[PDB]
Amino acid sequence: HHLPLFKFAIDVQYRSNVRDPRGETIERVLREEKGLPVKKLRLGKSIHLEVEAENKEKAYEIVKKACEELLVNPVVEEYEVREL
Amino acid sequence: HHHHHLPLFKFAIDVQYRSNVRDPRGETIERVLREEKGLPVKKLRLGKSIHLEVEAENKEKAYEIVKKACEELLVNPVVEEYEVREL
Amino acid sequence: HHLPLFKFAIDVQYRSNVRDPRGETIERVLREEKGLPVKKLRLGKSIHLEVEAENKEKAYEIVKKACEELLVNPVVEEYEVREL
Amino acid sequence: HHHHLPLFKFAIDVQYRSNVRDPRGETIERVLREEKGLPVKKLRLGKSIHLEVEAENKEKAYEIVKKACEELLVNPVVEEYEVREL
């Protein structure tokens, strides 16, 4: 069976109760060194991937499983998914 | 100034290695998903997702600041490309 | 200046009042031989492309130029654009 | 029984897989870049098939679309495809 393709980008971020010192350092550079009025800078991960699946709902289940099983730490991270 | 409101505009920046740059970290992750987790994912690429807020008179000026941040620091123009979206 | 990237899919189709004999033939095969209840089949073009530009309005302008200067024959075709 | 059978509209976006060379696409990208001066990259030219499918529900309609791809519309060796509702 030739299955349809579904492309995604997963946006993984630390939750709001986790400080992000790397993000803070970057932000300090932009503000103090580059003079840019930027705030609440957070450095997370963007995972692009695609999957062949029987339908869109199955594709999302695969995406969620990849997050649950490997990509996202449920205690410290949250994620959003978009279609490409 | 004069207690005038200054709006905040939130963005995400998706910074990815260009296609001619190898991504061995992504390859490792893809292989775990496929071979250890049994998930038929492919073309996996691992980049960076930077969320930030910008204080500015209007969204257009805020967008210019975001692009300046990428040029000046956030994106390596040789090995990375990037996409900005409003959050 | 390192400009942001904008990704698109262009869907080029014949206008509703242009006949599509290739579409009609494909539809005949799918219905008569393959037994599939398909109708109004239209064969058009899909062009995926990425543009660098200063903002989303300029990027759309680049897409419109690409259509008007090459990709779309205005006499017999129309297009839709979607973001990827 | 004169029972209503809904139509469901879909678009199939058919493209060559990434390991397949697309001289036509390459040509078009060169023309847009070099002849029209446009800042365009990674151009891929494929097929866009619009169709309507008469079926009891959308899920059954979608199954028919995939069957149409398998049986005729998509080359399994060199092409991939995405389906969306219109």
What structural domains does chain D harbor? 1-86 (3.30.1280.10)
Q: A5, D62: Cβ pair inside 8 Å? A: no
Contact A18, A75 (CB under 8 A): no
The first and second tokens of residue C10, run together, are 């262009």
Provide the shortest C-alpha distance from residue D3 to chain C (in Å).
15
Contacts of C48 in chain A (CB under 8 A): none
Give the three-class secondary structure for C34. coil
Contacts of A84 in chain C (CB under 8 A): 7, 84
Taking the C-alpha atoms of residue D50 and residue D8, their distance in angstroms, rounded to an integer, is 11
Q: A34, B8: Cβ pair inside 8 Å? A: no
Which technique was used to obtain these atomic coordinates? Answer: X-ray
Taking the C-alpha atoms of residue D24 and residue D44, their distance in angstroms, rounded to an integer, is 9
Q: Which chains lie within 8 Å of chain A at 3 or more CB pairs, if any?
A: B, C, D
> What is the total residue count of chain D?
86
The first and second tokens of residue A28, run together, are 């300090």
The first and second tokens of residue B67, run together, are 């692009």
Contact C48, D44 (CB under 8 A): yes
Q: D40, C65: Cβ pair inside 8 Å? A: no
Give the three-class secondary structure for C22. helix
Burial track B11-50 (b if 16+ CB lie within 10 A, e otherwise): bbbbbbbeeeeebeebeebbebbeeebebebeebbbbbbb
Residues 6+ away with beta carbon under 8 Å from A82: A8, A9, A11
Contact D68, C34 (CB under 8 A): yes
Taking the C-alpha atoms of residue D17 and residue C36, their distance in angstroms, rounded to an integer, is 26
The first and second tokens of residue D59, run together, are 């899920």
Q: Which amino acid is at D4?
A: H
**Distance from chain centroid for Cα D58:** 18
Residues 6+ away with beta carbon under 8 Å from B81: B15, B16, B17, B18, B75, C5
Contacts of C7 in chain A (CB under 8 A): 84
For chains A and C, CB pairs below 8 A equal: 3
Those residues of chain A whose CB sits closer than 8 Å to some CB in chain D are 1-7, 52, 54-55
Question: Half-sphere exposure (CA, 13 Å, Cβ side) for C13?
Answer: 20
Contacts of C2 in chain B (CB under 8 A): 70-71, 75, 77, 82
DSSP C3: P
